[PDB]
Design a protein around this ligand. Structure first.
Ligand SMILES: CC(=O)N[C@@H]([C@@H](O)[C@H](O)[C@H](O)CO)[C@@H](O)C[C@@H](OP(=O)(O)O)C(=O)O
Ligand SMILES: CC(=O)N[C@@H]([C@@H](O)[C@H](O)[C@H](O)CO)[C@@H](O)C[C@@H](OP(=O)(O)O)C(=O)O
Ligand SMILES: [Mn+2]
Ligand SMILES: [Mn+2]
Lengths: 348, 348
């Protein structure tokens, strides 16, 4: 597909690299460090490489209008949800340290200037911009100025809209990924449109391409790997019985382990070319391909024809089935036995 | 992707149709009808739509040379394997009837003229040509003359080689599918090259495209569905403890059920376009997108600027973040409160 790559800390991402699964803890901790650490533990023990947070600072990310508006996956205002779930700066610094103490990478999504600046003080190795902020060009400008790679989700946005964000990122000269995404919690399979990933790669040839997903299972992400995706994001929980608006579409340790295994298999299986010769098929080719044989007894001097020739396994005859018609009209140099392979010496 | 379709009996296959899984019993019955019927039962109970056989007639498909040649997945000659596993005509007619008695479709692969003619007497609704016969042009001509759709596997063959077979099929005027395939039993993930499917569709725009697979699990076939595959073939057994050269790469009832579920999900998720507007995202767009707000108290008569304006959720403000820069240089028509959304009435 392509050779685009960049590093998130010491981890290379790109088509020629192992896909990267981002375990999005997000707001799943419901504002509790005990719960957050239990989820980091679970991620670690499952084999995760990256844990992503959401950095919410209620007053800088929302005006008072947000106290009147309810998201699709809750029955209270988005302001109330964020007031309940948001970690303060001190606590989020502890979370980052904890994630790093487990040898994993910590990144986060910012939803405001104040959050961008907080994350820069913490010096995270890459910045996630959520689909809601994909068209937030002032915020994109700010984050791109930080000098680190950007992972940009592109739900709810057209190629045209995304173009302006990519323009800002390139000007700042940082590498970037684009994740195709659909922001319904949860998302039905029919709304995923994996082909959206192809649209993105075509429009933005220098982007690393992946999928951020909110379906109920791993199928969409697995398809994404097959199509060439390099980054996969699902929300993550230690257990599915947890409360919270995003828990329903979250993976857990077991399903994370499944995705990691599948992603590895599909990283190996994907791409390549039809005409590539595969050495291990040789024993099959040698028995399975056909050679030209006599379909009847043929007397010396008689002409070979489609009437007295046919083809049979295996492939070690002097004449391959590919050469069948070329023997038509040749002259038997000797008597030929029905069922025998036609030999070079059997023809004049 | 495309709108190519044809029917196998009453079952439509093509990109706009549910993918079709072919349960390849092949030689797995080791020549026993009891075992074959146990495998048909298992297929039926698992939810299979199609059971495929292999029609082996040892004397017409192989010359005596085959008694000296061993396949990659056995330690005895291919002749001995086929003598052991081949069902005679009477028995194969019983198998077909049994499959049809369970409401499933019966098809088979021929490896010889005699087998083609046997299958035509049985009037099967579509003919499978295995990868070994993909370059067997005389046999392809014969089968195409029968007037039924052809499913052609293309392992071990280049686009160039396949072209000659497609030419023969088109001349006969029957619809056809091409299955990408790698013929190692089993096949490592790295040798699958799913991109081979794209190569085929590009080269042969009128073909229905699928995958015939010999890996140890469902990952390759799932990837194939994501890429647009319409037909999936794996060998099938009622249980994995059975003896035989192809058992190791076979699916069983449980894994068939998994593939069917995955294929359905990925049929729904695949393709589509990035720019398609998804109604269910609307509640997310309404809270997540930003509007322009005052970043400081602005006195009446003062000029709006990037210094006193910023952006915040939610998206119901008079000015979207998209319009942010257009307010620069406008004149406050009244005092504006820090944190308030900029209203149309706030500017001259
Ligand atoms: C529109 C939005 O901000 N959605 C939140 C989501 O977790 C909400 O905070 C939650 O569902 C509110 O109920 C995340 O899905 C956003 C997420 O990015 P993506 O899902 O757009 O890839 C991120 O990087 O934080
Ligand atoms: C080269 C060949 O004929 N391989 C056999 C296979 O089952 C052998 O009979 C078996 O492995 C011999 O040990 C099948 O895989 C062929 C199979 O087609 P495909 O695997 O090329 O799609 C078919 O349609 O019958
Ligand atoms: Mn998300
Ligand atoms: Mn096969």
């Amino acid at each position: 597909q392509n050779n685009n790559e960049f590093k998130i800390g010491n981890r290379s991402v790109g088509y020629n690299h192992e896909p990267l699964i981002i375990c999005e803890i997000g707001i799943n901790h419901e504002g509790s460090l005990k719960t957050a650490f239990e989820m980091v533990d679970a991620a670690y023990n499952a084999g995760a490489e990256v844990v992503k947070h959401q950095t919410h600072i209620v007053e800088d990310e929302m005006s008072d209008e947000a106290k009147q508006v309810i998201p699709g996956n809750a029955d209270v205002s988005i302001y109330e949800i964020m007031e309940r779930c948001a970690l303060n700066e001190e606590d989020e610094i502890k979370l980052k340290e904890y994630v790093e103490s487990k040898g994993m990478i910590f990144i986060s999504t910012l939803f405001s200037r104040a959050a961008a600046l907080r994350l820069q003080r913490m010096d995270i190795p890459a910045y996630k911009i959520g689909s809601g902020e994909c068209n937030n060009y002032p915020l994109i400008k700010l984050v791109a100025s930080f000098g680190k790679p950007i992972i940009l989700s592109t739900g709810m946005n057209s190629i045209e809209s995304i173009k302006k964000s990519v323009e800002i990122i390139r000007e700042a000269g940082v590498p970037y990924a684009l994740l195709h995404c659909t922001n319904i919690y949860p998302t039905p399979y029919e709304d995923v449109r994996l082909g959206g990933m192809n649209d993105l790669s075509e429009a933005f040839p220098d982007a690393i391409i992946g999928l951020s997903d909110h379906t109920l299972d791993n199928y969409a992400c697995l398809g994404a790997v097959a199509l060439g995706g390099s980054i996969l994001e699902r929300h993550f929980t230690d257990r599915m019985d947890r409360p919270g608006p995003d828990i329903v579409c979250s993976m857990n340790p077991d399903t994370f382990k499944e995705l990691k295994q599948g992603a590895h298999a599909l990283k190996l299986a994907r791409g390549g070319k039809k005409d590539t010769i595969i050495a291990g098929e040789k024993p099959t080719k040698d028995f399975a391909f056909a050679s030209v044989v006599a379909d009847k007894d043929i007397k010396k001097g008689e002409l070979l024809s489609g009437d007295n020739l046919w083809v049979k396994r295996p492939g070690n005859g002097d004449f391959s089935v590919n050469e069948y018609e070329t023997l038509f009209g040749k002259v038997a140099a000797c008597n030929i036995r029905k069922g025998a392979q036609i030999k070079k010496t059997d023809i004049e």
